[PDB]
Amino acid sequence: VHLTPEEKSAVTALWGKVNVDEVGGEALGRLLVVYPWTQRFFESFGDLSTPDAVMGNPKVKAHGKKVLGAFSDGLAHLDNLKGTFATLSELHCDKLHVDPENFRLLGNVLVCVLAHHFGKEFTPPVQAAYQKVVAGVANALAHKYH
Amino acid sequence: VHLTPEEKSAVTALWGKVNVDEVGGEALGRLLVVYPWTQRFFESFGDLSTPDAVMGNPKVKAHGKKVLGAFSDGLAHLDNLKGTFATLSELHCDKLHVDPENFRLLGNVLVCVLAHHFGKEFTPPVQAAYQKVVAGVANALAHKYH
Amino acid sequence: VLSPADKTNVKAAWGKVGAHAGEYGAEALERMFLSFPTTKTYFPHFDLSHGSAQVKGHGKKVADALTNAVAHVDDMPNALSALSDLHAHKLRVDPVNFKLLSHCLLVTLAAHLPAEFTPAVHASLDKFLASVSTVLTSK
Amino acid sequence: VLSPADKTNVKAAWGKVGAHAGEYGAEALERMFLSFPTTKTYFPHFDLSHGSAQVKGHGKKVADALTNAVAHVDDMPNALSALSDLHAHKLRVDPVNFKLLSHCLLVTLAAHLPAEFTPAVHASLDKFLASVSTVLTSK
Ligand code: HEM
Ligand code: HEM
């Protein structure tokens, strides 16, 4: 996960404009709607019986916030994602047993959310830098599997 | 890629019985037969128009030998697969542009070959140790993508 | 299978794309090439630079294939048969690559349809593209 | 789609498995649980230790489902419909897990059919299991 200075620039500039109280819940919600098996890990969240139910679900929004919190952290340590995500790895890997493919999926969902919110501004080069980022994070979160 | 002593034992014991002049070509051949898109990277090998053609193809057997050579190396350095496979990574990643999913596939094919050749001896615990190994290798070979 | 709701969501999003479909197909391809450089090797004889006439031309082909799939949504294997043959046999496109282009197609719609790209429509489109991908890798 | 050659190869391998099918299904499950520990969480109420009556019992269910698919190979969506519903809706089995069990099913046949597991038969079986997996994840 080496971003060029131009890739770094693209990521951080957009990321400063991100609404950290909303984008996370938007991405988790979409995950649970688009890839319904992921709802297996969130039975305690309540009504996930509809899209509207999922998106408007307070536990989804709440949890999505912490997820995006985690992403914001990695964006700060692209130099050392392994160390940054080590503990979250143990949790998702050793305790939750979430298949790592789902980390790649959530990353791609986040990318669709950023595109939705930013439109034209989410250019193909900007997307490419972000794909580097979400792949680096998914991989680090999956390290306790390797 | 930490193998327990029992996992290490299982791998090395079986591996000493492997016919290194044959198992590699068997695994590559099967790869090209079972997942035909991989034949895209081996157009220069000649007649791949049939299973028999692929398996009996001298360039397949020949190349499979070097592949298995690479695997034998990693089995020697489970402690440092990254460093071991670095150069092969650049090649498959930066020069060949083989999608890394195919590394996982070839690993699984190798596992089927070992099961075929060893029957009962390829027990479920022995398989589990080998899955740890072929995942570690695939991941290291894919590092020049991360 | 695609539910009637899915079919309704997809036909809708298509409607809003309207005549920008070819243009969006081109943008989708560019997004794929930049984000997933391994995909570029299938296009050695294309200039893949931004504004490339060849990428624009191919984007229209892709968007037309997808529109044909939508228009014959209940009979996709038949509709996409010649393309299935093309991609699996001649081109030997790696199955993983269909997931990559699908993702870039979704990103592209998202960046162009603020109102239409709701979670439900996102879900329906993902399923549509996976169905197309399934057909295209069946041979 | 599955060619007639594939159908012939699969029906053959099934023939040789004969009455060991349930036993091989159990072994396949054990191989999956040990090799891919994430899969174990779908079976919290099973004892997954070697020799487990519950794993043996489930292995027979799985092998019977696969035999039913072989026996109605041209009509798998219909044949496997109730199981598609079960796996996608109630159990919400992650799609990746079907690739894992498929691999372990192939490993298990390989370890038991020296003569039958040729490259062509390997190819046909892989395609058969991917077709089953496709059906089981369609809902
Ligand atoms: C893709 C990147 C992901 C990141 C960055 C991430 C991050 C996090 C964070 C920050 C927490 C809170 C931990 C705490 O409360 O101390 C968490 C918990 C949790 N995660 Fe994720 N997550 C990701 C993907 C996933 C996926 C894909 C799933 C399931 C499909 C999942 C399932 C869970 C569950 C069930 C919990 C709560 C479990 C508990 O608190 O015991 N995560 N994750
Ligand atoms: C899975 C683990 C793999 C290992 C350990 C491996 C190892 C090797 C080795 C040792 C060589 C010889 C390099 C040399 O001549 O110096 C090689 C070359 C090559 N590999 Fe692989 N390989 C793997 C997977 C793959 C896959 C899946 C593909 C394509 C689907 C592939 C495509 C190629 C090609 C086309 C060459 C020759 C290219 C050249 O010499 O310029 N490899 N690999």
Ligand code: HEM
């Ligand atoms: C939604 C998925 C896809 C659709 C609908 C689609 C559609 C098409 C169509 C309609 C053509 C015919 C172009 C012509 O006749 O001039 C074509 C050709 C081609 N496709 Fe795709 N495709 C898809 C996925 C892919 C992927 C994932 C790849 C590789 C990354 C790929 C690589 C190619 C190549 C290399 C050609 C030949 C282009 C040329 O030489 O002009 N396709 N595709």
Ligand code: HEM
């Ligand atoms: C070839 C692929 C598969 C086949 C043919 C198959 C077959 C079956 C069958 C026939 C049943 C019904 C058992 C009964 O009614 O008592 C069942 C149930 C079940 N399956 Fe599968 N399955 C497959 C893949 C998977 C995978 C990949 C998983 C998860 C890793 C899974 C998890 C389960 C679970 C948790 C049950 C309920 C078992 C119980 O509570 O007794 N299946 N499956």
